[PDB]
Design a protein around this nucleic acid. Structure first.
Ligand SMILES: Nc1ncnc2c1ncn2[C@@H]1O[C@H](COP(=O)(O)OP(=O)(O)OP(=O)(O)O)[C@@H](O)[C@H]1O
Ligand SMILES: [Ca+2]
Ligand SMILES: [Ca+2]
Length: 1203
RNA sequence: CUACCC
RNA sequence: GGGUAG
């Protein structure tokens, strides 16, 4: 207690300065008003000077006009909550009508014209509130569109009005150009990349007018990009903006554009990581059913929320026990989750996207300075995002020496909540100190315990998903004979006992039905708990009247609507979302629960444009109803990819393309073109002359030309494609070639495998003198294997890796290949493998069928090269089921040696390095899987595994030749585990070749046979392989060359020399659309052609039908049309503010699916699920339908994008 | 169901 | 068979 706290508020609501900074400036003023504020005047600029270490990121932008005189601004702070308040506005605006009176176009002028006032806010707020930049533009006619407050633009035209100047200002605000025309270039900034890319190109070995033409062409695009001229006008992007003016009378002069916090940079701060350090300095001085509550900390930046959250961490660790960027502190009764919410806009991208919803936020306010002017925006953020309960806490209460003064700070927060319809009179307010609590002051540590004691009561217990009224999203439908109709999908909320009545609501009049039975895979239970994958039976209702996306809920719990209001976040350019904004008639599909549903929207009053990376309110009105209530996390699919997300906010009352064109295209799509002889050979020959290289003369040289390994990377890249492009051309006329040669090698695949299987059974050679290198690695391999593998494949990882998948089995064929035609049909087992199948029968109540039991598998031949074929082996369906099982555990486990099989990036990436480093060598064996003998497989594997590999393998096979064979090879190609085993075998050996030669085994990577190791180890590894059966492919193992290849990426001195093969006889336009495309990608860098190859491209582009030349799609979307600039495409229909394009699609007539097998497969998937920006967890797998490939070509419409 | 590939 | 984009 000092002087009276009465007229200290007189020093507040006459100034607005800090709480204690009044009384302390009043104690040094001797009970006077004036001279106290005269202190604050000078001792407030000192504080303003302290604001230099406060980096300002947020801000506003302001614009204003008079006649035809425009002006922009960039006055900015460091928080959203400030910029949106009625205070930063009163200042920012007032310094923008100061630029109207006088054309103040010099930042330094107005920066000082308001300095005595600029401090009057920071003393009242406490942020580095400083004006940044200002500029004005004059011209004939000038308009200005402003995006909310984040971006403002000024553009001056000539022949235009609000119908135009606003629209292109919307383009300046959207497409962000830096110049007006391709002419606006400093020759220095141009001859920068004209000289910097010359090296790029000339180093590769491109003649003058190649590299020059390419670079000029690329920079012609590079300049074209920033060119406001050549830039697809945002509103109608078919045409460039420069094209719009010429078509329009008009001609713009110039343009100004500001985005807040542009070039500000600085370093991003993460709340969660930091508090770990706030806690650390203070450190050194059963019941898992407890509810989860999402709390958040909201308040001033300098009021130390981050100090409080540390106290609520460490003091909560002193008693009971202690999305990223959130802490996870506990309490005796509950389990919390505590986020920091500093950005208004970057919290709506958390409530909406659901990355961090809210169950009740905590209101941190320093008691030394009371509530700040921007507190009414914090509290606003609460009652505008729908936070249930707000808990207030006075931080730093020791700085007040009078409780009569502290009581009066409550009057400034209790009434600040009453204005925002919060229980101000009945809200909890803890007066404490966090900094004191970080120390050991338990007198103050009771305050954190007082606050933490209020989350335990004031905040309501979250209705555990079990207790919420029943609901199950229908994910699929099956009509089983003897089961009526069953639907599946993980039940979202509630319990379903068998017999209870439910409602099927989705699109049709909501129908009602009783639950006959609820079941899983292994169990056929009776009650269905929430958050479990099940299948519920329905009586008196069949398949025809249950669509997907429908829900299966308790009657009268959830109603179907089609017109609601909602808020959505749009994914930015750097989030996969559309790198183009959209306007009024945006028509996407709203992916709800399981199904997708199209529909229109609208904008709330006054917004006309929304960009990628925005929050926005809207009124969604979809096509046909879906069952809903507020809180449905719905995403926003555009053509199968999601570009938005959102939550339904409140639900309301409820309520161009050329078809002829696609039919024209479809007709030409089926047009079979015709060529005088071999088209491919001509395309490839006429391509060789495009490169100076000598063309093929006969049809033999297509697969007998050996490329030289020297010259520029250009002298190689094309000389290499020559040798490779033809290789797989199956239709070779005078080819005396066969598929029988494939069998001839398969003979040696066992003949070699026999000679090794036999000889690899005598570890003692004759006596004890000699010591071989092969045996040595085997010994080491063997020990290495088992430390990584185990004694026997645990049934834990056995059952939950086995799966029915692929196509062909000895029982089935390519037609009956889907996983549903495996549960439906009786698949064949094998003598030893029976015991497993029986276990599966004992694993469930469903039917497990074995037709024959035989130890045979069909040996066939799949097309491979033009000089040879393959010899894959079709395995029995039950062996394959378990083979894929072990291959999944023997895969995941093979990741500890750093080998990733479902990511072959990490193997062609190291083929890159080796093409330069010359230390990494790529190795290819000759017949990988077929050369792996039973002998070697036996010596290495643990005998437990070596049995699980002997039970599941097919020991005998039957050829087309009638003749049978017993497999010397432990397993052939097509076998359900061989790929993993061969990877592990080779990797095992490769590592043993490393440690034996004093070298890192962790420098070894193996992808099947595509193995990569230290170059030194090569002659050892090669001699190891000579022993252990295998044989290296001199032609495809590279150790000393400038060239390396791996996982289908070839490299020459770090340059990309990946060729492309011409495969089947080119005939239908589909085959030529594709070929042109590969040659497009192989010869282009960002829409810029290699001129030489561009000739034969345009030349054979003529071969295609008329319409089938102007039909282009951006690369990455397939080969349904030629790849080109889609901005061009005539066919491209702009529907619903989204570009739609027609492309060639293989035509299919549907076939009836095995309802039995598909259902059994559907609940088998939901057993392998259970035992196994940040929101693709709103999506799931598709239902089962079979479609036979006809022969026709249909045309499907898809979604596309710019670049 | 369509490219690429071990 | 298997990876990987549609
Ligand atoms: N249809 C297939 N079924 C099973 N495995 C296959 C198939 N196609 C390729 N592979 C796998 O790719 C690996 C590498 O194949 P690669 O193309 O090197 O043929 P290779 O059989 O190893 O001998 P070659 O060098 O003579 O082709 C093989 O070990 C094999 O396991
Ligand atoms: Ca090989
Ligand atoms: Ca290989």
């Amino acid at each position: 207690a000092e002087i009276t706290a009465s007229l200290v508020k007189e020093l507040r609501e006459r100034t607005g300065a800090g709480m204690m900074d009044c009384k302390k400036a009043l104690t040094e003023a001797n009970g006077d008003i004036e001279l106290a504020i005269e202190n604050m005047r000078k001792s407030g600029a000192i504080k303003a000077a302290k604001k230099a270490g406060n980096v300002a990121a947020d801000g506003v932008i302001k614009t204003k006009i008079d006649g035809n005189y425009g002006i922009i601004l960039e006055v900015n702070c460091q928080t959203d909550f400030v910029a949106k308040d009625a205070g930063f506005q009163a200042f920012a605006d007032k310094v923008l009508d100061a630029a109207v009176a006088g054309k103040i176009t010099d930042v330094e002028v107005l920066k000082a014209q308001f300095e005595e006032e600029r401090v009057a806010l920071v003393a009242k707020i406490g942020e580095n509130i400083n004006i940044r930049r200002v500029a004005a533009l004059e011209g004939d006619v000038l308009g200005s569109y402003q995006h909310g407050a984040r971006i403002g633009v000024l553009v001056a035209a000539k022949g235009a009005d609000e119908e135009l100047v606003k629209h292109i200002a919307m383009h300046v605000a959207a497409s962000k150009p830096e110049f007006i025309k391709p002419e606006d270039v400093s020759a220095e900034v141009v001859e920068k990349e004209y000289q910097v890319q010359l090296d790029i190109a000339m180093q590769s070995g491109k003649p003058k007018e190649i590299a020059e033409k390419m670079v000029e062409g690329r920079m012609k695009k590079f300049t074209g990009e920033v060119s406001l001229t050549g830039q697809p006008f945002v509103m109608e992007p078919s045409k460039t903006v420069g094209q719009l003016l010429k078509e329009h009378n008009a001609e713009v002069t110039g343009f100004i554009r500001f985005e807040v916090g542009e070039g500000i940079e600085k370093v991003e701060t993460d709340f969660a990581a930091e508090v770990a350090a706030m806690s650390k300095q203070s450190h050194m001085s059963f019941e898992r059913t407890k509810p989860h509550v999402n709390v958040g900390t909201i308040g001033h930046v300098d009021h130390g929320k981050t100090t409080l959250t540390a106290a609520i961490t460490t003091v909560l660790a002193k008693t009971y026990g202690g999305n990223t960027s959130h802490v996870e502190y506990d309490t005796p009764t509950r389990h919390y989750a505590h986020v920091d919410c500093p950005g208004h806009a970057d919290y709506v991208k958390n409530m909406i996207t659901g990355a961090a919803q809210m169950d009740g936020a905590i209101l941190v306010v320093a008691a030394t300075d009371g509530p700040m002017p921007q507190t009414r925006e914090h509290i606003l953020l609460g009652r505008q995002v729908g936070v249930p309960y707000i808990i207030v806490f006075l931080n730093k209460c020791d700085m007040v020496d009078d409780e009569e003064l502290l009581e009066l700070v409550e009057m400034e927060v209790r009434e600040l909540l009453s204005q925002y319809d919060f229980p101000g009179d009945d809200t909890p307010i803890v007066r404490g100190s966090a900094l004191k609590a970080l120390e050991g002051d338990a007198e103050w540590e009771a305050k954190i315990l007082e606050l933490a004691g209020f989350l335990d009561s004031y905040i309501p217990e979250p209705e555990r998903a079990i207790d919420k009224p029943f609901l199950l999203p229908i994910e699929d439908v099956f009509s089983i004979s003897g089961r009526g109709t069953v639907v599946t999908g993980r039940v979202e909320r509630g319990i379903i006992k068998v017999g209870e009545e439910v409602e099927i609501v989705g699109i049709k009049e909501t129908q009602k039905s009783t639950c006959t039975g609820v079941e899983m895979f292994r169990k056929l239970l009776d009650e269905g708990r929430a958050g479990e994958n099940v299948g519920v039976l329905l009586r008196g209702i069949k398949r025809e009247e249950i669509e997907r996306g429908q829900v299966l809920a308790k009657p009268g719990t959830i109603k179907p609507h089609t017109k609601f209001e909602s808020e959505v976040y749009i994914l930015s350019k750097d989030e996969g979302g559309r790198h183009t904004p959209f306007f009024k008639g945006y028509r996407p599909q709203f992916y709800f629960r399981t199904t997708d549903v199209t529909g229109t929207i609208e904008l709330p009053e006054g917004v006309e444009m929304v960009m990628p990376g925005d929050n926005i309110k809207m009124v969604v009105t979809l096509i046909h109803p879906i069952a809903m209530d507020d809180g449905l996390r719905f995403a926003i699919r555009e053509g199968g990819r999601t570009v938005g997300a959102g939550v339904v906010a409140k639900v309301l009352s409820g309520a161009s393309s050329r078809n002829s064109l696609s039919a024209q295209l479809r007709r030409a799509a089926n047009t079979r073109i015709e060529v005088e002889g071999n088209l491919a050979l001509s395309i490839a020959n006429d391509l060789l002359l495009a490169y100076g290289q000598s063309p093929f003369n006969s049809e033999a040289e297509c697969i007998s030309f050996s490329p030289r390994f020297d010259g520029t990377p250009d002298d190689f890249r094309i000389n290499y494609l020559k040798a490779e492009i033809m290789s797989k051309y199956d239709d070779f006329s005078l080819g005396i070639d066969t598929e029988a040669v494939a069998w001839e090698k398969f003979l040696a695949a066992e003949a070699e495998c026999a000679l090794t299987n036999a000889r690899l059974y005598r570890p003692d050679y004759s006596e004890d003198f000699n010591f071989s290198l092969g045996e040595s690695c085997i010994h080491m391999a063997r020990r290495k294997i088992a430390k990584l593998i185990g004694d026997v494949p645990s049934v834990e990882g056995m059952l939950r890796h086995c799966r029915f998948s692929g196509g062909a089995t000895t029982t089935n064929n390519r037609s009956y290949g889907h996983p549903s035609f495996k549960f439906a049909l009786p698949q064949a087992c094998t003598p030893r493998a029976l015991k497993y199948v029986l276990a599966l029968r004992a694993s469930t109540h469903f039917d497990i069928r074995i037709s024959d039991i035989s130890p045979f598998n069909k040996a066939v031949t799949v097309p491979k090269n033009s000089k040879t074929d393959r010899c894959i082996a079709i395995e029995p369906g039950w062996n394959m089921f378990f083979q894929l099982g072990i291959g999944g555990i023997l895969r995941d486990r093979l990741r500890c040696w750093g080998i990733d099989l479902n990511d072959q990036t990490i193997n062609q990436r190291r083929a890159h390095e080796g093409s330069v480093t010359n230390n990494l060598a790529t190795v290819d064996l000759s017949a990988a899987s077929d050369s792996i003998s039973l002998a070697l497989c036996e010596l290495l594997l643990p005998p437990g595994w070596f049995e699980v590999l002997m039970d599941l393998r097919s020991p005998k096979g039957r050829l087309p030749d009638g003749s049978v064979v017993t497999y010397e090879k432990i397993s052939s190609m097509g076998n359900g585990y061989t790929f993993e085993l061969e990877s592990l075998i080779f990797a095992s050996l490769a590592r043993s070749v490393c440690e034996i030669l004093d070298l890192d085994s962790s420098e070894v990577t193996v992808y099947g046979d595509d193995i990569i190791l230290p170059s030194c180890a090569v002659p050892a590894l090669r001699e190891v392989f000579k022993y252990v059966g295998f044989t290296t492919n001199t032609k495809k193992t590279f150790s000393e060359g400038p060239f390396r290849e791996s996982c289908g990426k070839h490299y020459y001195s770090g340059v990309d020399v990946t060729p492309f093969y011409i495969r089947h006889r080119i005939v239908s336009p589909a085959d030529l659309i594709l070929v042109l495309n590969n040659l497009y990608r192989w010869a282009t860098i960002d829409g810029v052609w290699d001129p030489r190859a561009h000739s034969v491209y345009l030349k054979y582009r003529k071969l295609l039908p008329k319409q089938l030349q102007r039909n282009t799609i951006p690369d990455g979307y397939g080969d349904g049309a030629l790849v080109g600039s889609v901005l061009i495409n005539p066919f491209a229909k702009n529907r619903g503010w989204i570009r739609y394009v027609p492309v060639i699609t293989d035509h299919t007539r549907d076939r009836e699916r095995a309802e039995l097998g598909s259902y059994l497969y559907d609940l088998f998937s939901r057993c392998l699920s259970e035992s196994n920006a940040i929101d693709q967890l709103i999506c799931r797998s598709n239902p089962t339908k079979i479609s036979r490939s006809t022969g026709k070509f249909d045309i499907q419409y898809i979604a596309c994008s710019s670049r």
